[PDB]
């Protein structure tokens, strides 16, 4: 909600309270999304100030407050800053920003990250260029310096992040993306490669000294219709865990497919149909293993722009004999969102 | 403070900074409220959007930021989300919301939770239906579908919450409350019962497979006068700790009484007089033991609606030979509140 | 940003997103400021309500959200409440507030805490009266009851804070400051002494039962020019660590000097030149050792009041044979700030 706007500076304070609950059988240990209360809230700000006609400064922060913890010792479980960055946009020269933000390969995966509650399985956090990461400097150009309507690109520099955990770490790397949008149609190509840290290399699963990730996407976005598809692959970048051995590391190789089809009725109802499948290849020990594999059917109903509710239903196709221990049960999420 | 209100959506961003200090003798280990700096702040939002004349969507989040921690490792001590839920209210049909919110038995205990700094001792957090809990779906009806002015009820479904701690856990249960308000007078009755988790049962104190809590309340609220009284009981629901043995669990049984008398002078001064006593029965090993027992005398002075200061004084009636180790010293809280 | 102002109550919600990165060689273990992503954000509120013509109530809270943590287990690293207090100001009688706030000796050190990214090295947190501490009650008087323009003083009472750590702890103490400002010129004198806790005394380094800190400051602030200087000393108050022995405690004695010279060009550029040196005397075992010692050259460029960027460069004068293990390498900070 734009709570402030004076002297060329406008501040949008935004947030939401999401009552949420997952239904899966058993202790949801073997299901797709788990089970039980998953309530949470978000609070963030996006500011933008016009330094002059061609120059704009801007910043953004967003935090995640779990609403399913007790007020006891576990009270902070799941809380975190999702985004934190500042930047400048100059005329048709492009924008530049630095901070915790989205990796460039997500310029592609974004296409199918449209499910009511699930989806976007391959867009992991602190996992190089596919989701939100810290220490990324991003340059973006729109309409090719204003010379080509619809042609955009981006290059991104990822600074080394040596964390206590191999999962949340990364070495230096570069990434880029090129996309093109013509009247409802959009196509993207994105790619990044980075150094792996000592600790990532000291891991049991996955083998290499460089991580890679690319994804391409195609979409048709117009006339109440949204159809999108993604295909990408990765080398030693996707994190996996053998639940049996309690071993961990990264998939040597994966091939990822994501399809989404949705329609927005005029009265508020937006049905969703989706398909996801990410399979790992050459896992040291297992061979080829599915990591994610399911059909999604769900629907969101918008009361207006501040209120909505939805049911997301995962029809898990993973099978009980999955070598890594990946869960095979179904999950149903029901939620009620208020937002501003 | 209502910082936003356009297109039927109004956002109230609220909060407070409370400079607070407790005075108790010794290391306040044996006193009622402890001793020393207890400064803290609150930040929350309450939004409400009119989807149409009969339908309203709404959400709320509130957080607690301790102001008495260092900026060192202990910096997060005491921080937590207090409330987080979204919901809908439809015409005279009632409201429904889901998230971290107040258990229904507090519809009763609320009556006497009016002290300047203390009071409301029996309304514990993450303790089934008496205080704030996670994963509660609540239906509330006002004026009996609009057919009976002043007659309200509520039913609430509590979802299992298996936490790492027996204190912060709960099984599934249902609760309800009926209250009636006629011209300054109000009466309430509230009740809930729930399953106890394995871990709650594995505890040294308390014995059963079901937790119960009911409370009734009576109040006279008009003419600058506020007089209220509560009486309730519980089975295996109230958490207790033997300080000697360092044993823990729940009271098999308790009987709780709370009385409050206050007056609001026209110039800002609101004196308070209260009495509280909660006694546990059949504690495995001790027999009957008082858990809370005191007189309260205090006063709040309102400079206006954003500024106030108060002194709350607990005249502890617990005695030094209390079998559980419950403290017997007095405590005096002084505080200065700014809020919006 | 003043997001609210009605009925004599105005709320200023403020914050910033700072994309930040440090450049130091090696693993920045031996450099002055470290190395890598240091992105972060701030969110705070300052409220003020006019109770009547002579009386004002007010409160403030400010929090620090690190933007360089993953969304994993380390997500909360560095987060904390910086300030949290409420208070009243009455006519020319003075103001009083209580909560987590700035120690009075900082009324002096503030003079030179003006560097783009570094500086203010002696103004440690939870370190008695020099930086932000919890449980301080502060009385401030301006213009000597309105009888002497430019003459101000303050007295401050610090309540004992027994934390789990000797570094973040303190006993009771009192502090005061007197300053005088005449047309661009300002002079200050500040002083405080406090009890040290058992745990502080149980430490390997430093010896005494009372901590002291005083600093004097001189400044010339006018005509786009800012020149300031500080000199202060401390007894058993400054925290130090022998990196070799991994020993810790407080410096028996230190002598601190800080000089700053800056100029604000009309077009937005504010160059900075500074010098800092804090040396410990009588360290048990080492003798005299420098703790901080460097030249700073840097510059901030203001796009407007909401957007700026800067480069701060530390020319470390500490030498590689520093007895405590204090780092000797240089550090360069580059940052881009959006704020409101
Ligand atoms: C505003 C500061 C930007 C700092 C960018 C640092 C990038 C470091 O490594 C990039 C490797 O690719
Ligand atoms: C909007 C989602 C509501 C989900 C309610 C789940 C209730 C589960 O158990 C209740 C037991 O009583
Ligand atoms: C508004 C409450 C103020 C409480 C101040 C307590 C000060 C305690 O010790 C001070 C020692 O000097």
Curated annotation (Swiss-Prot), chains A, B, C:
It comes from the Bacteria. The chain crosses the membrane at residues 1-6, 8-23, 39-51, 54-66, 83-91, 94-100, 135-141, 150-159, 172-182, 184-195, 211-222, 224-235, 253-265, 268-281, 292-303, 306-315, 331-340. Keywords: Cell outer membrane, Ion transport, Membrane, Porin, Protein transport, Signal, Transmembrane, Transmembrane beta strand, Transport. The keyword Transmembrane applies. Pfam families: Porin_1. Residues 7, 52-53, 92-93, 142-149, 183, 223, 266-267, 304-305 are periplasmic. Its main location: membrane. Induction: By growth in low osmolarity conditions (low sugar or salt); activated at low osmolarity by OmpR, repressed at high osmolarity by OmpR (at protein level). Levels of OmpF protein decrease in a lon/ycgE double disruption (at protein level). One of its GO terms (biological process) is protein transport. One of its GO terms (cellular component) is pore complex. Forms pores that allow passive diffusion of small molecules across the outer membrane. (Microbial infection) It is also a receptor for the bacteriophage T2. Is the major receptor for colicin E5. Each subunit of the trimer has a water-filled pore with a narrow, elliptically shaped (7 X 11 Angstroms) selectivity filter which has a solvent accessible area of 30-40 Angstroms(2). Homotrimer. Forms mixed heterotrimers with OmpC and with PhoE; other mixed heterotrimers are also probable. Belongs to the Gram-negative porin family. This is Outer membrane porin F. It comes from Escherichia coli (strain K12).
